[PDB]
Amino acid sequence: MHIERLAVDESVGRAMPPQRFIEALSDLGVPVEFAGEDEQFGPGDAVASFGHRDAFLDADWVHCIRAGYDEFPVGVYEEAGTYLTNSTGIHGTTVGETVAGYMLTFARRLHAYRDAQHDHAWDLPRYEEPFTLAGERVCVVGLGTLGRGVVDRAAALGMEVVGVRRSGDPVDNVSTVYTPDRLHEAIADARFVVLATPLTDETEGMVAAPEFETMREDASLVNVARGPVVVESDLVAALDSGDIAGAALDVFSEEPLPEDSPLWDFEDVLITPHVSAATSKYHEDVAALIRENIEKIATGDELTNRVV
Amino acid sequence: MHIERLAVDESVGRAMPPQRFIEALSDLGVPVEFAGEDEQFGPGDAVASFGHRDAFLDADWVHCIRAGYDEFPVGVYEEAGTYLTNSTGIHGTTVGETVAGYMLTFARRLHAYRDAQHDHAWDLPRYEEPFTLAGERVCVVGLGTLGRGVVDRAAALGMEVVGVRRSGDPVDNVSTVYTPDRLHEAIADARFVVLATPLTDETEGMVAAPEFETMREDASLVNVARGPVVVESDLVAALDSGDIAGAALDVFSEEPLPEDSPLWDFEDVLITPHVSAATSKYHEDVAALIRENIEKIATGDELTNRVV
Ligand SMILES: NC(=O)C1=CN([C@@H]2O[C@H](COP(=O)(O)OP(=O)(O)OC[C@H]3O[C@@H](n4cnc5c(N)ncnc54)[C@H](OP(=O)(O)O)[C@@H]3O)[C@@H](O)[C@H]2O)C=CC1
Ligand SMILES: NC(=O)C1=CN([C@@H]2O[C@H](COP(=O)(O)OP(=O)(O)OC[C@H]3O[C@@H](n4cnc5c(N)ncnc54)[C@H](OP(=O)(O)O)[C@@H]3O)[C@@H](O)[C@H]2O)C=CC1
Ligand SMILES: CCCC[C@@H](O)C(=O)O
Ligand SMILES: [Mg+2]
Ligand SMILES: [Mg+2]
Ligand SMILES: [Mg+2]
Ligand SMILES: [Mg+2]
Ligand SMILES: [Mg+2]
Ligand SMILES: [Mg+2]
Ligand SMILES: [Mg+2]
């Protein structure tokens, strides 16, 4: 690989202003150019993009500007001989902070107060409603960049932390790590269950009616992974039946979440519009990954975040 | 002083169910009795109360179940020989968590999402709006139990932390401690300014138009102290003018906050109903101070949290 050009697909617009991103890449040593839906690639092309296009298969290298690459046909890239990288490793602080925010919102009742603020109502909680995260248990399912960002902040707040990962191996600040076949043991005693796994064959529909049964009735689910990791209809049923207490949800089976979803109306559900990782500096964070991999290519070393 | 009785004033019901507090004081070595608003007191009586009654001055000891004793006439107690203690030392975790919650709410825009949830609207923030607390500066004004509860959590979240206290003496996790005569220096570069001082002759009206001028236009004020530490009309004016960005307010010059107050309507104000220290274990927290002081009276040692 000898890269002569970085093309920036217009789909990066879904996550950030393209112009800001192009300006963040200006002294790379190769030209950085905007590319639209209908363009052609070839030897020496690198491409930064949000979604997949078949035209990218003519390029040497595609960088997906998301951590999740579940919408990329990974097998076709391998067969085409086209390198594919992702943006894992940059979302730990933003997502960890958002999730700390969700848990504190539930513990301190901030969402109920915000509801009351609209009515100008000085509504006091029941004595038993407010609690402290200190001493409460969180189970973090997926212990990568997102999961660890959550873990570190939960641990800092004095929470008891357990979690689940594919390898079952120790993780700093996690008292007990479980393999995925022991999910029900992991979630059983947790006040919060946080989902931070990629969407894969194995994780799709992982959290469904049996898991909501196992969960504490006073527990909340947090999904910052992908919508289809949860069976959304089972989630609705569990919330209506009281199998769990509530949820903070950033990702959904259909996005935007349809207006007629029952999820919008549960008091103890927080809906956020796939923004748990949002940051005014996203363009710089992704640009740094692109720069790193340019140097890797130039010096003939293995790419950071290589999917295939 | 030899205590023969602990009277539990009915005003404790403003903070916790009195039956829960009475039962948590069962092993004091003296009887614990409820006291209505028309109750007589004499030698041997200790009282546990939320607010002041002149009737208390015939008792030997009043324990205020709040940290703030500004509604108690301290000069009137000293002259009368009646001991006064407060409940400072028990609100660090509850207030610390709530303030962390407020700051994360603003950084991650959760309040705006909650507003959109009511309308079933999938409304992304503007790109420049979401940020991370990590790397941002907070000034904590008041470095006692509440202030340290805030500091420790802000520091753990990766914030730069400075603060203000009377003595100027070092405090763990505060990088620069200022005395109150350098308030403007302390607050000028802060993204968040947090108030955690008592209401005193010195602190009343501390934060007014000139301080809102000094503060960053992108900064937010957090008030978990007492309403009159801030000049409320100057706050409204500052929020209208954009001298600051917003505020999280748990305390007000008049509580409950009047429906007609303009503070309810600012998008970037969070109103909470004097609940930043709310917890379902408050009865246990308050009882343990009372137990402590009972033992110190027996051994004839100096009381904890003695006011006069
Ligand atoms: N809401 C949002 O805006 C965002 C969502 N995401 C989503 O989060 C996902 C995770 O991203 P990131 O943390 O960067 O990814 P990482 O690759 O850093 O980590 C993935 C983690 O998931 C674990 N894992 C894999 N399969 C399973 C399983 N079956 N059960 C439990 N754990 C499993 C891995 O285990 P091991 O450690 O053993 O390998 C690893 O700990 C992305 O794929 C994306 O879908 C990402 C960014 C933002
Ligand atoms: N919203 C709520 O529900 C609650 C509100 N509060 C309020 O918080 C107040 C503080 O409580 P707590 O932290 O327990 O009290 P503490 O006595 O532990 O701490 C008070 C702090 O205020 C500092 N201070 C005093 N005067 C000034 C000033 N002029 N400028 C800067 N700092 C000053 C003191 O400085 P130094 O240490 O140097 O003397 C001390 O560090 C209470 O009096 C009460 O009004 C308390 C509990 C709950
Ligand atoms: C969109 C950029 C991050 C958000 C999510 O898409 C991801 O997988 O990273
Ligand atoms: Mg309710
Ligand atoms: Mg259940
Ligand atoms: Mg707006
Ligand atoms: Mg930051
Ligand atoms: Mg003054
Ligand atoms: Mg002044
Ligand atoms: Mg209104």
Author numbering:
A (entry chain B), B (entry chain A): 1 to 308
The authors write:
Here we describe the molecular basis of the reaction mechanism and dual NADH/NADPH-specificity of D2HDH, a 2-hydroxyacid dehydrogenase from the extreme halophile Haloferax mediterranei, an organism whose proteins have to remain active in high intracellular concentrations of KCl. Sequence analysis has identified D2HDH as a member of the DDH clade of the D-isomer specific 2-hydroxyacid dehydrogenase enzyme family (2HADH), which has potential applications in the synthesis of chiral fine chemicals including alcohols, and hydroxy or amino acids from ketones or ketoacids. Structural studies have shown that all members of this family share a common fold based on two domains, which cycle between open and closed conformational states that serve to close the inter-domain cleft, bringing the substrates together during catalysis. The D2HDH dimer has an overall ellipsoidal appearance in which each monomer is folded into two domains (d1; residues 1–92 and 283–308 and d2; residues 93–282).
Thus far, to our knowledge, no structures of the wider DDH family have been determined with a reduced hydroxy acid substrate. To better understand the mode of product recognition by D2HDH, we attempted to grow crystals of a non-productive ternary complex of the enzyme with a variety of 2-hydroxyacids (including 2-hydroxyhexanoic acid) and NAD(P)H, to complement the 2-ketoacid structures described above, but the crystals that were obtained were of poor quality, and not suitable for structure determination. Under these crystallization conditions the enzyme would be expected to turn over the substrates leading to crystals that might contain a mixture of oxidised and reduced components. Given that the equilibrium constant favours the production of the reduced substrate, reaction turnover would lead to significant oxidation of the NAD(P)H to NAD(P)+ and the concomitant accumulation of mM concentrations of D-2-hydroxyhexanoic acid, albeit in a mixture with unreacted ketoacid in excess compared to the protein concentration (~0.1 mM). In this structure the refined electron density was planar for the nicotinamide ring consistent with the major component bound at the active site being the oxidised cofactor. Although the electron density for the substrate was clear, it could not be explained by either a ketoacid or a D-2-hydroxyacid alone. For example, fitting the density with a ketoacid left a significant additional bulge close to the substrate C2, particularly for subunit B. This suggested that a mixture of reduced and oxidised substrate was present. Careful refinement of this structure showed that the substrate density could be best explained as a 2:1 mixture of 2-ketohexanoic acid in the abortive orientation and D-2-hydroxyhexanoic acid in a productive orientation.
